[PDB]
Amino acid sequence: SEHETRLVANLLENYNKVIRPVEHHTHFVDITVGLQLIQLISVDEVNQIVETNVRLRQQWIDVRLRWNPADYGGIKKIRLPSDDVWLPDLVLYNNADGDFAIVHMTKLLLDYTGKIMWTPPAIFKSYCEIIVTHFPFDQQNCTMKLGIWTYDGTKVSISPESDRPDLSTFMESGEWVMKDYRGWKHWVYYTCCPDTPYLDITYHFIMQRIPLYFVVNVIIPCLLFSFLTGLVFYLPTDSGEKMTLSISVLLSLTVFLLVIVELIPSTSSAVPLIGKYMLFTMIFVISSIIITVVVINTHHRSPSTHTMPQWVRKIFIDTIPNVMFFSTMKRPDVKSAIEGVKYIAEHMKSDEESSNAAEEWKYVAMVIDHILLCVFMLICIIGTVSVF
C-alpha cells in the first residue's frame, strides 16, 4: 500500500526505541498484561518443571506512534514489526530451563490513537514445586511469575487483563484437569528502596492428575502381588514350594519399587504415600517369609530330638482348633525266628510312636499357618470393605 508505506516511513523517521513512551519522564507506561494458556505441554515431576505454551498479550499506549487517519487514506491499524518500537522487558522470574524473556518477536498491531497490542507466543518452562504425597491422585499448584525486569513501579506499571488467565482456546491435556486458575498482582517493597515499589503478576494453575493410567499400570499389579503375598499360608509345607511363591512375590514387589522410584522426584520434603505403602508391603512380605520359614522348621522337626512342650500342645491342639468354625480341621533257629518277629514288632512300635509325634508337630505347623491365613484374610476383608 502506498499510503501505508508513507505512514510507516513517517512514523519511524525520528523514533527512538530506547526511550519509554511517556510524555514526561515522571509518568509511567501503564501496561496491561494477560496470559493465554494454549496448551499444557508437560509436567516433569522428577525435574519439577512445567512446560506450557502461552501467548503473552501486552497492551499499552505509545503517543509517539499516533497519526491522523484522514491524512493517510483512512488507515486505522498497521502491523509493525516488534523490533522497531519500544517493548517492555517482561521476564518470567521463576524460569527453570527455558528463556527468561520473549524470544519470538512477532508483529504488533498499532491503532491510530497510539494503542499497541502485542501477542507473542512463548514456551515457559517454569519451576513447579511438585508435591508427591498423594501420587498418583495428587493436586499440583505451581505458578508463572512475570514482571518487568529493569523498571520499577514508578516507570513501568503492569496490570492483569482479568482476574483469570484466558483459557478459552485451551487444549485439553488428557492427563491433567484445570481445576482452578487465577492471576494476582503483587506489590513488593524492599528495605533499600521503599519509595519505589516493584510490581509483579503471578498466574497460578491448579492441576488435578487423571490417575487411570498410573492406576492400571502400577497400582493394580502391586495390589495383585500384595494379595498373593498371603496365599503362601495356604500352601502345604509338604509341597516344598512355599519359598518359591514367597520369594517370587518379594522380587516382584522390589521390581515395582524400582518402578516407583524412577517415577517420582528424589525430594525428601514429603514421603510419597505410594512408596510408604510399598515399603509396608515389603515389610509384610519379609515377615511372611520369616514366619513361613519358622513354620517349615516346625513342620520338619525331628520327634527324636525335639519334644513338644506342654504349653505348645495346649495352645495349638486343645483350644485354637475349636475356635475356627470355617475350617475343616480334625478336633535253635526257631528261637532266632521268633526273636526276629518280635524285633519287627518292636520296630513297628517305635515307628508308630515317632510318626505320631511327627504328626503332632505337623498339626501344630498347620494350625500356625491357618492362624496367619485368617489374619491375612481379615486384613483383606477390612481393607476392601473400607476403601471400596
Binding site: 518359591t244 522390589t254 519287627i344
Partner: protein, 409 residues
Amino acid sequence: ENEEGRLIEKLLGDYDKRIIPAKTLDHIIDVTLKLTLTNLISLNEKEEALTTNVWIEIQWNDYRLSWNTSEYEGIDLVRIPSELLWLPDVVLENNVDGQFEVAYYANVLVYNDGSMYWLPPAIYRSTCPIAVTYFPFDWQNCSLVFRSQTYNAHEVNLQLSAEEGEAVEWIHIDPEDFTENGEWTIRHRPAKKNYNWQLTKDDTDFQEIIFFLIIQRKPLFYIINIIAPCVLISSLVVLVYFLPAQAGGQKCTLSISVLLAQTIFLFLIAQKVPETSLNVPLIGKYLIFVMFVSMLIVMNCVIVLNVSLRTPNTHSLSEKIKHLFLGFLPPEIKSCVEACNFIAKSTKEQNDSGSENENWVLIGKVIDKACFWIALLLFSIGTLAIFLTGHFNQVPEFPFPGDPRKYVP
C-alpha cells in the same frame, strides 16, 4: 517530550562500545560482582553438573556516560540496553556446556555519576566434581567461577560487592525469591576472590571470583526407597539356616534368590551415581559386602546339603568327626524258619542304615546352627558399621577449614 530522549542521544552519540572506559593509561576499572541464588534447580550426578537460577549483579564506573542532572530536568537515572554499552566480559569459566555469557541481556542502569549497574538473570550449568564416597549421605562442594573472558588484572579489577561498607562475601539469598530444592539443603555459601599464582597479572586467568555452595543431600528418600528394602532383603540370607537340609527344603533357592535381588539393587545403584572411578559409593560398598556374604552362605548351604545327604554307601562316618560334632559343639519248617530269619536280618540292616542317615542329618544340623550364628553376627556388624559411618558424615563447621570465619550476613 520524554527528556531521556535527547540525553540518551547525546550520551550514546560518539561512544565506542569496543573501548574500555579507562580514563588514563594506569586507570583500572573496578568491576564489582554479587551473586543472588533464586533456585538450586538441580545437580545432575551422572553429568556432574549443577544447574542454578542466579541473578548476577555487576557494577562498574564508565566515565563517558555522565551528565549534569540540572541540565536534563533532574534525570538522575536511565536504562540503556546492554548491547549498546561497553561491558566487562564477566563469564562463568567452569561451565559444562558452551554457555559462557548470561541468558538474558537485561538493561543497564546508568547513574549521572557514571555508575553502571547491570543485573542480568542467568541459568548456569557449572561443573561440580562429586565425591561419592558417602552416597547417599554425602555433601557436595559445588563452585561457580567468574572471571573476565577478555581483560586482565591490568585493565579490570574484579572485586566482591561492598554493601554498607562491608564486603559481601556470600551468595546472597533473598527469602522473597528462593524455593528450597527439597533434595539439597544449603549449609555454607561463601564467596572469595582467588588468584592463580602460576600466571602473572596478565593472561586473563590471573584473578577469579569464586562462589561456593556447600550443599547437603537429604537422605530420607534414598533411605526409604533403596537402603531399607536392600537391608530387608539381605537380612533373609540368615533364614536358610533353619530350612530342612533335604529335598524340598529350598535352601539354595532362597540363597540364590537373595543374591539375585542384591544384584538387581547393585544395578539400580549404578544408575544413580556418576561413573567416576576415584571412589566406591558407600551403598555400593555395602552391596558388595552383602553379595559376598550371600555367596559365602550359598557355599555354606551347598556344604551343609552335601553333609546331611550323605549315605553309608558313598561316605564313611568317621568316629572322630562324630565325636567332634556330637560331643563338643552341641522240610517246610526249615524253609519257613530260614525265610523268617532272612526277613529279620534285612529289616535290622535297613534300620541301621536309617540310623546312620539320621546321624549324618544331626551333624548337618549342628554345622548349620554354628554357621548361622557366625553369619548373623557378620551381617549385622557389617550393616550397622557401614550405615553408622554413613550417618556420621557431617558437613564441616566452617566453609574453609583453615579460616575461622562463618561467611554469613
